[PDB]
Amino acid sequence: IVGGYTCGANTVPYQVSLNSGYHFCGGSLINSQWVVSAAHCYKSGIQVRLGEDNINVVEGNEQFISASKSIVHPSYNSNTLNNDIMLIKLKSAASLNSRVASISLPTSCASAGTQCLISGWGNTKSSGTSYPDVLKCLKAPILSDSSCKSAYPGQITSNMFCAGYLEGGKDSCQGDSGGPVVCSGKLQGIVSWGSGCAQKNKPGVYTKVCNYVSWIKQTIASN
Numbered sequence: 001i002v003g004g005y006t007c008g009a010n011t012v013p014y015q016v017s018l019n020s021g022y023h024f025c026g027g028s029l030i031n032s033q034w035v036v037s038a039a040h041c042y043k044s045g046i047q048v049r050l051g052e053d054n055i056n057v058v059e060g061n062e063q064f065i066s067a068s069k070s071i072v073h074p075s076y077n078s079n080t081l082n083n084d085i086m087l088i089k090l091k092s093a094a095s096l097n098s099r100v101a102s103i104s105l106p107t108s109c110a111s112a113g114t115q116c117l118i119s120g121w122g123n124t125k126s127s128g129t130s131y132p133d134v135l136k137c138l139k140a141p142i143l144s145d146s147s148c149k150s151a152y153p154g155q156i157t158s159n160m161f162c163a164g165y166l167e168g169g170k171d172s173c174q175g176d177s178g179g180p181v182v183c184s185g186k187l188q189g190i191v192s193w194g195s196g197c198a199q200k201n202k203p204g205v206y207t208k209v210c211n212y213v214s215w216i217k218q219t220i221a222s223n
């Protein structure tokens with residue numbers, strides 16, 4: 001997260017860190033047994049880490065659970081990142097508490113202008129590199145589809161939306177991938193892609209979760 005702020009320990013209880021010997025992507029807990037992340041975060045040997053703040057220090061409220069199954073969306077296209085969503089089932093159900101909680105799925109799509117909360121452990125520098133230990137946060141509005149498509153001509157599909165600031169300075173980044181974009185208490189987006197980080201007229205691109213609620217619900221119920 002670039003231009004963001006330190007969230008505060010466990011203030012985003014649904015935020016998860018995917019670890020394969022190191023943090024490589026974020027995710028969102030949608031119920032005690034399932035996590036939603038980005039398809040481009042797919043990899044073998046994933047351990048889900050819940051209740052995390054400083055990912056390099058065991059602070060006492062964490063739960064480390066191995067993934068038993070990963071399901072990448074059937075239509076995911078790695079070339080274009082269209083349908084960049086994946087489900088991860090935990091080997092054992094997480095113990096839900098104030099620091100480890102699920103985030104509800106949307107019942108409808110959010111409109112442009114709606115303010116959302118984006119979080120993650122990605123790089124915090126627009127130019128250069130610096131990875132934080134604690135969770136970073138960023139409040140950003142959903143941008144109009146016209147402004148989104150104008151920034152990325154011929155790259156935006158109906159399964160994507162942009163959020164952030166066209167002036168630059170605030171944006172998600174490398175390491176935040178797969179993480180949550182919550183608006184009005186619902187998981188509306190997944191950190192997917194963008195051009196560089198916090199660059200002018202190059203807002204972040206997010207997977208439009210509302211288009212996948214039926215798939216998520218049906219897939220979880222059958223697995």
Ligand SMILES: Cc1ccccc1-c1cc2ccc(C(=N)N)cc2[nH]1
Binds near residue numbers: 171192195196197
């Ligand atoms: C597009 C891409 C190809 C290969 C590896 C990483 C990425 C990538 C992920 C990613 C996440 C977020 C952003 C952003 N500036 N909001 C940009 C990004 N860019």
Ligand SMILES: [Ca+2]
Binds near residue numbers: 056059
């Ligand atoms: Ca920790």
